[PDB]
Ligand binder design. Structure first.
Ligand SMILES: [Zn+2]
Ligand SMILES: [Zn+2]
Ligand SMILES: [Zn+2]
Ligand SMILES: [Zn+2]
Ligand SMILES: [Zn+2]
Ligand SMILES: [Zn+2]
Ligand SMILES: [Zn+2]
Ligand SMILES: [Zn+2]
Ligand SMILES: [Zn+2]
Ligand SMILES: [Zn+2]
Ligand SMILES: [Zn+2]
Ligand SMILES: [Zn+2]
Lengths: 259, 259, 259, 259, 259, 259
């Protein structure tokens, strides 16, 4: 069976795909984090994994097992790391994980990697992981390893799509934690993991121009979300999914032109 | 839907479970590693995750997202880290991962964790992770966190079952990499991920009383397996499954008596 | 002389200010990074140090010696770390530094800290430094240390002020590297360090919804800036300064009410 | 005086041996661990050091100063790290020590190392240290450094010798902590350090198919041993000693053929 | 304006200086430490920074932003890290900082670095940072990076100058913390930051041939100094300044001959 | 047999000694370092181990197995780490080894430790290890752990003894590497390991007031020593031994008064 997930292939099949030249590998990077009263906690892993799978199917790429645990939830982006259920890694651990995988891919013969982040707070640690691995590769004489890092939601740029998605004006990706964007993509991909009836509607989260630590629970909406997902629909999820899959597929074609 | 996987629950459902007292958490610890010409490479994650799921169903416990990447494959227990596809973590990374997760579970209020290893080489790193996290927990005033660590195959002890499993004498867990045990359990759980027709039968791997680094590819059977899986049957897998689930379930009942 | 810089005070003076209760400490966190053809490279340290000094003077707070080196410059926010002159730290070093400072301040008896970031890329590492330090403090029995983190430019929110600052529409803080904002504030504080005649005007930087590593120099404007600073004026700098100093001062009063 | 211990040589003598070509270095790796009421705690260092010395005398190799401290004692292999006297290092420490040593040997010009473990628990950390050092060596252009790692007791494989050693059936290396094997070898090398009269006989240690942490002292024989050493005799020691020295010497001749 | 400080140059100016060949960079390494009742706490940064500036002006070198935070104050050389105000870094942090800077300078194309230490305790950590950096550089194929490390006060060797400076016999650099040497140099450069009238005269600090931890506060003079600076004069400072500036200037000339 | 070495005791004996109250532990910390043409390379371990043994015998203390590998040899104190045979650890490795051993001793119930350094360069890394351990201990609620650190040669202060030792004026401990002091003490303790006939006499090593890296081999005397040991005599060794053993013993009695 032609699976796009490396974990479902034999070693011989993987070896062949890599030896065939220009093989693109994709690593979903997510989190185990609270996502309100209406959705499950593995969202940030599921979403980018699903987007990877589809992109991989379109462009003939392979998908690695996704990073289930990400960096600590930040109040203004994920509610905060004081919530139960959210299980976060330290900076160094995330960074090291990414670094170790890149080194191993290099060992395999891979030279093309797409890292798809699904958890906002991961960014910089993913970036450090990449720099540190590339730095090591140079020590090993390898200079042709290329990585494309992206957060799938950033591919939703078209104002027409945004407008169609947010007929009320777009608030921003910051407060899109457990909101319309994710819940909707979730409704179209894993309906069993989402129950709109538990959505505790509330006004979009607002914060001062600074942060406070220890994180003050009172400053996050009780439900854990940063914006309400009552207007979330599967239809929206379907639109997002296509927009993302297509845009990412094209980006990858641009950065990783077949040889 | 009563899922046993924490990742499929809302934070509120999880919070209630923990607050109810004596909630038991289960963390599958695996690897992405070549498993011969006849099986996929996520075996070491899939097996302990499946066993955890059934045990959790039987005893009312919860399962965490499994660690997909494990410690470097060793020649005498997994064929060696020179094989393509197998993607391994450095020891510090894996240790840090376990340590971060335990720390977070303590923050959640959990005090009962069962770590179920599916990759031989992870053991000592898992142990260090536990030790560092418990050390820290003491600094924090927490002395009631309890961990049970196990490699699921160790519960297949009954000589009658071993005999029935290996009518030819038991060779040992060492060379059980991609052999009868796993392929069998794989046949009863994920048949699509296993194709007995590609099994490259060969004599059980044998090694001198020492190890050589850099790992010498000639000292591992070409297929990557350390023993043949042609005698692997789904029936065998079914017997292993029950023995393991029942034995583990009981063990957890012993160590984690309901309060 | 009543200096607001801890470094210019004697230990007895400092000790007194701390024993006096509710003493607020301020740490500037910047970088040594190229800022185009028209400004010096220590902007990210000077600016937040200047804002801290003035805020401190208004609220009676103390300012620490600023962190001169920051995290690696990123293409989409600082041009990239491939530029000469910019001298960056690894993520663990920056995090370590913040953590070490916080731990020592705690030792001093300080319980109130404001971290003022001047370099966009530092954020997450500062955050990690804070979390790791506070985690340690809890081990030490200290639970009343409070930290306020902020990037001074985030206090320029008022649309009227933004409009006055950017009569042409606001492009965003992303591309504000060596642009109007910084160069203006720079013209009102350190005019010697800025020479508008070298400003290589160019269209605002634009990037695809993803990142590439190794960093592609061609994707950054030649000058190193992400937006032109020709419309930068000292008058604008003066407005920004007051807006920031006032906003931050009031924020600190809210978060750190005198006891 | 032709000592086989590097530490007893001048740097000029060592340099010549290394310069002479194919010089084999041997590093003993042990531990400071409780070994019952009847033996001293440095056993795990002394034993491998003694075997190294005699092997080196036979093949003309050199022996490094042994690593005195090893990884934390584990319940099912060495009684547990709760016992007084046993002084254990963290995993990163032991790994780093092995990594630093190999890096230095490489610097000297050495390209042949035999690591002789005497403490069961050290294995994986020694392995990580070897891996990390070799990786680094590649960065440095050195690909001809070869390492042989072994636990001296694994050289006792001959069923005839095992039978002669354990006329009662062999229990396994697991419970051979402070048992017949070590006590005997200790009676033939350092009798003053062993007093068979304090041997607290008890039935061989048995454990469930899993581990528990924090370590439960009640699960370990009060004496600290995992099997009785009353049947331990000097004669057995002498047989073990020869079997090991000879088998190891031959292995080294196989892996490190004179050039 | 021809500034000698890299932070005050544009990147283009710096790039030109480096591309011109044999450009020498100077990094002041200090601390934020208590310096008695009479001086500010940034002395250790100020002093080496001042020396660097003057040397640089004489030999045409560039000066980096100084390390504001140094290693932990030790009792017998700096009073002890139990004093308020003194804010110290962990060894790993300081070493990492120096390692990172060196790595970056190498990236710039710099191959000549002068490290000027102003805090006694930094030495070995600066040394380890240099060693770790150079080791890495070799991995990267760079073998022509050369570092000169020095404590500016060591250039005050001439017995005549020593005599003239300490007409009473020289006590040693050990107790020269907040004493005559620094206070004088301080009087000739930053008079505002020094007030001789608060100088709490006391006999030179004496200690047994060992150290005690935790640091015992009673064993350190209450003022925080290890020797009195009442005899400190601006005149002395001027002498010291010239002696250091000239001696270091010449040393750099020797070590870094113009190409 | 009343051995003063922990390693030669059973755990029960050790348990008793610790339980009896105020039991002092001593850790020799040395190196494997070239010591010229006339002596062996384990000197820095042997010497402090010997002195510990005798001090322990005199005050009833226990001695831990010594740290066989120390920090990188520095040109101005040990000749440099470019010499073959010398096998050094990274700073972090040394520091962690010290930190782990202290943590374990505290677990044992020990609260009194004497660290005796025999390798000049080890100092600051031993210090960091003590500080880190102590910091941890406080976290664990332990505040009565006390440590005394010393380099045994520092107890040779009496000008009469120095005169008697160096009838030619004392040069300093810096260039006392492989010189009279060590060679002498070596002649009275391990004559077999020293051969005065190979002593390559040379003038005391002299160096500019700065250091250069990479280490320049030409700046260190060819033999590896920093001062000639031709005037080294066993008689001198005996005098040193007593002066050290007595002065240390007294120091321990002062810092660790029997309860
Ligand atoms: Zn999310
Ligand atoms: Zn998230
Ligand atoms: Zn497997
Ligand atoms: Zn495996
Ligand atoms: Zn800037
Ligand atoms: Zn910046
Ligand atoms: Zn043993
Ligand atoms: Zn052992
Ligand atoms: Zn000073
Ligand atoms: Zn100082
Ligand atoms: Zn020495
Ligand atoms: Zn030495």
């Amino acid at each position: 069976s032609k699976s796009v997930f490396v974990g479902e292939l034999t070693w011989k099949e993987y070896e062949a795909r890599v030896a065939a030249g220009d093989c693109v590998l994709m690593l979903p990077v997510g989190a185990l984090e609270q996502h309100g009263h209406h959705m499950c906690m593995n969202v940030d892993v599921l979403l980018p994994t699903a987007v990877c799978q589809r992109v991989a199917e379109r462009i003939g790429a392979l998908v690695l097992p996704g990073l289930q645990y990400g960096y600590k939830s930040q109040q203004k982006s994920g509610g905060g790391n004081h919530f139960p259920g959210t299980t976060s890694l330290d900076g160094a651990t995330l960074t090291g994980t990414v670094q170790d995988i890149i080194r191993e891919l290099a060992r395999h013969g891979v030279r093309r990697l797409v890292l798809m982040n699904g958890h906002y707070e991961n960014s910089m640690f993913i970036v450090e992981g990449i720099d540190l691995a590339l730095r090591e590769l140079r020590y090993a004489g390898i200079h042709d390893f290329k990585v494309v890092v992206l957060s799938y939601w950033d591919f939703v740029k078209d104002p027409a799509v945004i407008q169609r998605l947010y007929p009320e004006g777009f608030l921003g990706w910051d407060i899109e934690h457990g909101g319309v964007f994710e819940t909707s993509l979730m409704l179209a991909l894993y309906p069993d993991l989402v129950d709109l009836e538990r959505v505790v509607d509330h006004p979009p989260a607002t914060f001062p121009p600074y942060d406070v630590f220890p994180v003050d629970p009172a400053r996050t909406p009780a439900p854990g979300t940063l914006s309400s997902a009552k207007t979330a629909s599967r239809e929206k999820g379907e639109l997002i999914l296509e927009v993302c899959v297509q845009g990412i597929a094209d980006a990858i074609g641009q950065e990783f032109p077949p040889t």
